[PDB]
Amino acid sequence: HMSICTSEEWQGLMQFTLPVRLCKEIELFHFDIGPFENMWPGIFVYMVHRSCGTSCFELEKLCRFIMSVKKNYRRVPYHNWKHAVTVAHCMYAILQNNHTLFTDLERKGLLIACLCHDLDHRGFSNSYLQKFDHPLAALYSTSTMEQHHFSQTVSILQLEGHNIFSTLSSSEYEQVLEIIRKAIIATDLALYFGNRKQLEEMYQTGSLNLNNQSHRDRVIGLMMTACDLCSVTKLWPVTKLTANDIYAEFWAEGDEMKKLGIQPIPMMDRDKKDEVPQGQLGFYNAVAIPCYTTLTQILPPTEPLLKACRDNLSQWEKVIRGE
Amino acid sequence: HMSICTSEEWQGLMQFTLPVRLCKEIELFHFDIGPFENMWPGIFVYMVHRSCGTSCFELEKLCRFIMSVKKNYRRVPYHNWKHAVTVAHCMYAILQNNHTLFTDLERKGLLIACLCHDLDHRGFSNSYLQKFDHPLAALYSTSTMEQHHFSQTVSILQLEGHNIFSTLSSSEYEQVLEIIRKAIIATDLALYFGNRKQLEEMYQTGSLNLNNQSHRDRVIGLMMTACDLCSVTKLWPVTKLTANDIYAEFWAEGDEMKKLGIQPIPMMDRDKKDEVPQGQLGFYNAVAIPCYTTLTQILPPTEPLLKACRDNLSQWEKVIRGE
Ligand SMILES: COc1ccc(-n2c(CCN3C(=O)c4cccc(OC(C)C)c4C3=O)nc3ccccc3c2=O)cc1
Ligand SMILES: CC(C)(CO)n1c(=O)[nH]c2c3cccnc3n(-c3ccccc3)c(=O)c21
Ligand SMILES: [Mg+2]
Ligand SMILES: [Mg+2]
Ligand SMILES: [Zn+2]
Ligand SMILES: [Zn+2]
Numbered sequence: 001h002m003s004i005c006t007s008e009e010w011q012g013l014m015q016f017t018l019p020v021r022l023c024k025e026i027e028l029f030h031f032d033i034g035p036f037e038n039m040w041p042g043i044f045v046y047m048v049h050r051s052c053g054t055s056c057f058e059l060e061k062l063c064r065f066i067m068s069v070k071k072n073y074r075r076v077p078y079h080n081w082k083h084a085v086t087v088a089h090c091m092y093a094i095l096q097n098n099h100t101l102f103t104d105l106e107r108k109g110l111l112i113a114c115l116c117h118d119l120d121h122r123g124f125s126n127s128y129l130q131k132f133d134h135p136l137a138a139l140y141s142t143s144t145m146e147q148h149h150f151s152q153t154v155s156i157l158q159l160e161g162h163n164i165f166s167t168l169s170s171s172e173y174e175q176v177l178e179i180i181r182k183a184i185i186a187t188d189l190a191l192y193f194g195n196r197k198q199l200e201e202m203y204q205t206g207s208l209n210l211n212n213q214s215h216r217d218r219v220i221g222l223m224m225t226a227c228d229l230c231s232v233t234k235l236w237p238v239t240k241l242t243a244n245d246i247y248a249e250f251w252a253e254g255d256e257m258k259k260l261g262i263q264p265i266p267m268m269d270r271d272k273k274d275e276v277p278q279g280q281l282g283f284y285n286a287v288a289i290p291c292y293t294t295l296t297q298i299l300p301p302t303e304p305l306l307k308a309c310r311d312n313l314s315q316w317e318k319v320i321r322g323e
Numbered sequence: 324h325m326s327i328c329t330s331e332e333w334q335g336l337m338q339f340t341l342p343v344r345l346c347k348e349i350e351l352f353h354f355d356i357g358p359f360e361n362m363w364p365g366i367f368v369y370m371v372h373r374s375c376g377t378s379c380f381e382l383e384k385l386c387r388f389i390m391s392v393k394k395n396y397r398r399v400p401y402h403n404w405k406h407a408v409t410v411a412h413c414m415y416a417i418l419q420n421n422h423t424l425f426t427d428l429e430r431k432g433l434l435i436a437c438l439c440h441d442l443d444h445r446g447f448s449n450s451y452l453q454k455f456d457h458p459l460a461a462l463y464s465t466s467t468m469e470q471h472h473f474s475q476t477v478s479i480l481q482l483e484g485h486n487i488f489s490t491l492s493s494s495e496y497e498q499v500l501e502i503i504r505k506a507i508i509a510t511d512l513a514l515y516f517g518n519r520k521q522l523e524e525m526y527q528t529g530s531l532n533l534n535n536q537s538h539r540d541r542v543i544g545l546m547m548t549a550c551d552l553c554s555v556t557k558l559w560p561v562t563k564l565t566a567n568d569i570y571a572e573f574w575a576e577g578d579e580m581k582k583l584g585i586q587p588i589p590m591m592d593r594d595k596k597d598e599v600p601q602g603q604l605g606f607y608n609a610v611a612i613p614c615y616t617t618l619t620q621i622l623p624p625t626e627p628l629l630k631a632c633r634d635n636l637s638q639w640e641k642v643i644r645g646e
Pocket of ligand 2: 260261262510512551552553554555565566567569603606
């Protein structure tokens, strides 16, 4: 039922070497992958090698995993392969700047989870699938898509010559699958508010214990959300272009409702496209700024993220005011 | 300007007596008015008299109102005089089964609002009038048609010997015009989704209180939508025939767009008649079933509506399956 890669695809990836100029840039939080589409699979390999090591995964098995993952990402406007590598890059930048804060079993799982977190996205919300009783909503009652993304990840790893986590003991293997499970479920934005709530109180009262697994998993969750929203941390022209992509996806979902006689929420309605600048300001103020603020409080090296978020908020604020 | 009834028309109505056989059928929710065309105006009078008494309105003024309302309903395939009386009948059945929950003034207003809710329908959607900048969209920015229906109701009552509420105190009169205003605006399906969602929430958290005017207006609104969609609660052959009438009206609207070059949505496209069973399944699942479900939860005697809705959904389910 999955979509395996061709021999051609993984072999070419194995041959790819990252140009020396982009070595500097890939270390920066505001790095846009956008202009280098042919390099995106190659960029993930680099990040995996630069973080955990050149001998952490079997190069053959790794290249087959990446290229098969790419094939299970649909041609949707925003929740595509480009997003999966943008999110992973941000995770790489965070994991680099907090090098001794996470175990090599967390480091491996976190990058793989970021590349897989939106696997098989059909450009529809959890609310859409529940409202139209889609077979996926029948399998997973809550965090519908996120539970499906995790199921597709597990299915890719279950393919011949794809299990990149096969060299781990049964204990070490079930441990990493759980890191990935939790990281992907955490990408369900509805769960985020509560997570950034509990993390805010835990930071204030100094109760956040990094040795406590339950507490550990909450930080990883926020790290996932911060990576998932990193489009608001890029330079203004990049940020502006990405906004157009997620709207195009939202509008297409609304169009599907309009066809059935249903009225979409303003966000999903393309006839309320002028409401987008105000909607962005609302999202940045209610979702993005709180996220990066708390992330910086827990992991201070992640400060540039919050800085770039603020810069873009100001840009949206200028758009509203008519520059 | 309006369309006044003839002396002949209202005089004959005053003389009409309902057949003793029908007395029991009119009390049932699944009652089809379709076979009794000559009796439709007479049926409304009966319902008025059995709901609010025989001395609630001046028989002369009432018969003139009904017959002139009938004349301001166009010969469109679905949004016609037959629809008005079907909607009103369903409202009568709901009022009857929950008699003491409502005031004599709401019973008066809701039945009149149901007979008037589609007054002067031209067989076009609000989406159409707005996209093609029709003069009616210039007057009313939102709920375009519904605001026009309320304006035509007020215009009929403003006719000589037509003011059926003239015998109410200035306070009662302005309260009944507001009951009607709100009930007709509520027939704009776009507003329904928010209304259903809010009411479901209020029921779940037990915060719903019929003594709270704001809550009361939300229930009346849902009652209006349930009545507006009662065609899906009739027996299968009736339900099937009505679907043909709304589609004849939608197809005519699509034809108007095709003439200007614009491509209608599948629902409004007559070359796309095969997608109709799936369109119905989507409408029943996303609109009709949620509606009756919530209505039954607020007013449990209205359960037959949800029962018959389910029976028709199963019928559409069978059509898709090739049964
Ligand atoms: C809970 O707080 C809010 C605040 C604002 C919104 N909102 C938005 C943001 C949409 N949106 C996401 O709901 C999202 C989720 C995840 C990522 C994302 O943007 C990515 C590119 C980072 C986005 C995004 O733009 N745009 C609108 C556009 C027109 C009219 C209304 C709105 C509106 O109410 C929604 C939720
Ligand atoms: C209920 C009916 C007529 C059943 O045949 N129906 C249908 O099949 N599709 C639809 C339908 C589909 C799309 C939008 N409105 C619809 N309405 C509608 C129209 C105007 C005001 C309120 C609701 C229906 O009555 C209906
Ligand atoms: Mg997601
Ligand atoms: Mg209407
Ligand atoms: Zn994502
Ligand atoms: Zn109607």
